[PDB]
Amino acid sequence: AGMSLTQVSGPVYVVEDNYYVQENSMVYFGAKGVTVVGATWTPDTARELHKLIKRVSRKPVLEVINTNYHTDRAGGNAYWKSIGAKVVSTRQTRDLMKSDWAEIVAFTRKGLPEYPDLPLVLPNVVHDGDFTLQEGKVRAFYAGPAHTPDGIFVYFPDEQVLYGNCILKEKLGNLSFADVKAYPQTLERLKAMKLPIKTVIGGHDSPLHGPELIDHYEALIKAA
Ligand SMILES: O=C(O)c1ccnc(C(=O)O)c1
Ligand SMILES: [Zn+2]
């Protein structure tokens, strides 16, 4: 399919978005409603994800988290706003999106000319720090710069699932915005938190990994 939505553990689902360069995002089906982690590539891909969500649950999509300011994590925002979902980010992500959206769209279109010239759509729920959703069962945090300056991790304590965002993945991927020397320092700050992790969902390539995906990418970026 163009996109799939598949259970990984309990209420935690993985989105494989095969549009453009495959990106993986996540969905949490909560008691009051649905949290989407990563807005997907475009308003069209977001609409496709919503269609999948509505075959699983009748509960509203409450919020969508932009885990960085890039097109693969925020491109769907217009759609999510349009259906009354909150668009959630850190202040840093929001600020970088305001200043740099035009540039990331342009950059995206250099490699993907077919990608739409999307107007800026900012988060309307902005956090100054780390934050949680779903009664503490979705936990967003910053552990330093890596693939971009602002990228956050999302952790699901009950299921011991870590969303890797653009940060953790199988291949090196794109380093144009990366802080290559800080990247492993950020991964070591993450590892030092000693979070119980059974599963890491890579934001690109094949999603399903164990905690060793952290070590995998760390070794790669240290050779870059
Ligand atoms: O290869 C790309 O165009 C691409 C697009 C979005 N994200 C990444 C990444 O490495 O995170 C790479
Ligand atoms: Zn990415």
Encode 2-71 in three state secondary structure. CEEEEEEECCEEEEEECCCCCEEEEEEECCCCEEEECCCCCHHHHHHHHHHHHHHCCCCEEEEECCCCCH
Give me the resolution in angstroms, 1 decimal: 1.9
76, 25 in Cβ contact below 8 A? no
Protein residue whose Cα sits closest to atom 11 of ligand 1: 166
188, 151 in Cβ contact below 8 A? no
Residues whose CB is less than 8 angstroms from the CB of residue 16 and which lie 6 or more positions away in sequence, other chains included: 3, 4, 6, 22, 24, 207
Closest CA to 69 of 105, 110, 109, 36: 105
Q: Is 182 in the pocket of ligand 1 (CB under 6 A)?
A: no
Closest CA to 129 of 118, 140, 113: 140
What's the CATH code of the domain at 203?
A: 3.60.15.10
Q: Is 164 in the pocket of ligand 1 (CB under 6 A)?
A: no
Q: Is 73 in the pocket of ligand 1 (CB under 6 A)?
A: no
Q: Work out how many domains the chain is built from and give that number.
A: 1
Identify the DSSP state of 110. Answer: H
Residues, beta carbon < 5 Å, ion ligand 2: 72, 166
Report strand pairing: 138-141 vs 131-133: antiparallel
The residue whose CB lies within 8 Å of the most ligand 1 atoms, and thus the one to mutate among 72, 104, 171, is 72
To the question of whether residue 68 is assigned a binding role by annotation, the answer is no
The parent domain of residue 61 ranges over: 1-224
Q: How far apart (Å, rounded) are the C-alpha atoms in residues 209 and 224?
A: 22
Looking from the CA of residue 108, the nearest atom of ligand 1 is 3
